[PDB]
Amino acid sequence: GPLGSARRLYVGNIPFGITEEAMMDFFNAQMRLGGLTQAPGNPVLAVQINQDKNFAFLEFRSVDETTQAMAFDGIIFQGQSLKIRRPHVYQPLPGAHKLFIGGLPNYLNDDQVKELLTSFGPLKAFNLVKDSATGLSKGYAFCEYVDINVTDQAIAGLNGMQLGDKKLLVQRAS
Amino acid sequence: GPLGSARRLYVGNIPFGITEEAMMDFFNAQMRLGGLTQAPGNPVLAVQINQDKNFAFLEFRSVDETTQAMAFDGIIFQGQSLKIRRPHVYQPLPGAHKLFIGGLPNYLNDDQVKELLTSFGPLKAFNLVKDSATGLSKGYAFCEYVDINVTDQAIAGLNGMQLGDKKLLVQRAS
Numbered sequence: 140g141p142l143g144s145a146r147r148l149y150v151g152n153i154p155f156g157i158t159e160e161a162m163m164d165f166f167n168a169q170m171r172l173g174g175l176t177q178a179p180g181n182p183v184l185a186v187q188i189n190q191d192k193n194f195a196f197l198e199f200r201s202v203d204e205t206t207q208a209m210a211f212d213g214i215i216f217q218g219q220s221l222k223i224r225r226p227h228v229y230q231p232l233p234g235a236h237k238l239f240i241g242g243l244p245n246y247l248n249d250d251q252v253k254e255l256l257t258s259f260g261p262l263k264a265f266n267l268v269k270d271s272a273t274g275l276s277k278g279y280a281f282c283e284y285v286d287i288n289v290t291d292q293a294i295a296g297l298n299g300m301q302l303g304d305k306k307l308l309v310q311r312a313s
Numbered sequence: 314g315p316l317g318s319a320r321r322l323y324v325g326n327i328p329f330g331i332t333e334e335a336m337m338d339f340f341n342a343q344m345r346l347g348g349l350t351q352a353p354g355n356p357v358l359a360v361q362i363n364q365d366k367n368f369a370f371l372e373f374r375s376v377d378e379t380t381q382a383m384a385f386d387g388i389i390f391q392g393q394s395l396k397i398r399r400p401h402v403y404q405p406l407p408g409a410h411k412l413f414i415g416g417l418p419n420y421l422n423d424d425q426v427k428e429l430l431t432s433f434g435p436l437k438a439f440n441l442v443k444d445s446a447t448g449l450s451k452g453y454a455f456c457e458y459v460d461i462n463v464t465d466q467a468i469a470g471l472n473g474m475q476l477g478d479k480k481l482l483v484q485r486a487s
Contacts, residue, residue: 144328202330232392233329233330234328234329235331237329264363266366268366281367313393
């Protein structure tokens with residue numbers, strides 16, 4: 140997901156013929172050896188390998204252990220120095236691209252508001268705020284897109300949009 | 314209320330992905346650094362987070378320390394200015410923030426006087442004192458805002474202010 144991305148690392152320069160399980164054993168052993176684990180057990184949950192382009196992704200059980208594992212940049216595996224980096228979609232400041240959407244007609248339900256939003260791309264997060272007593276919409280929502288690069292286009296397309304007798308406010312929620 | 318939820322606070326705008334334990338440690342530390350703790354031990358007992366809607370409730374060990382912690386409103390926590398509030402079902406005892414309004418023109422009626430007051434927020438209580446036999450106004454009134462935080466705003470906004478030839482007096486009635 141979004142913080143699915145905070146638990147992954149890119150690994151380059153992987154040795155020829157390596158298997159996903161072997162990679163897993165190596166990094167779990169390294170984490171334990173260096174005492175970088177925050178709990179008993181294995182920090183690396185899974186590995187996906189692209190053999191043709193000589194890279195892999197590691198998926199970790201926690202955000203902090205992932206960060207610790209950046210320390211392994213340049214580590215030797217079967218005689219080769221691994222390249223360790225963040226995923227390109229990694230967010231150093233999480234929630235930075237969460238949007239606030241105000242000025243919604245208060246009769247719109249979840250599905251209807253998302254339909255307005257998903258015209259720019261899929262969402263990973265959404266919620267329409269309602270009065271708990273009555274279940275009536277308070278007229279504002281929050282969301283976050285799968286691809287954070289569409290955030291600013293969504294704002295450009297939707298902020299100020301006349302919606303019935305209402306005028307949308309779309310901005311980063313901060 | 315009337316005595317319900319005197320040891321809980323609403324915390325809005327919490328940092329994305331924060332755990333209940335981290336928030337608890339932060340507030341317990343601030344209580345201590347800020348000189349707001351009133352005894353050995355932690356003032357904050359528990360934290361309940363709604364991760365979907367980005368808020369928490371703090372549970373305190375004592376009534377008075379809950380009141381003290383209101384002073385943290387706006388504190389920055391991992392980039393975020395926290396919104397600290399009483400629980401919505403929390404209610405002050407009746408009359409706690411009653412206002413006296415003196416110096417009114419005596420030819421104005423109830424609604425005409427209410428209009429000046431409700432510009433700050435809705436009223437849960439109001440009475441313009443009238444000459445009972447004739448029904449005519451003695452030029453002073455009492456009121457009570459639904460939101461008690463509005464009280465100081467109404468005072469700031471109306472006290473000592475010119476209204477016709479008169480200077481208005483607006484103050485807590487007790």
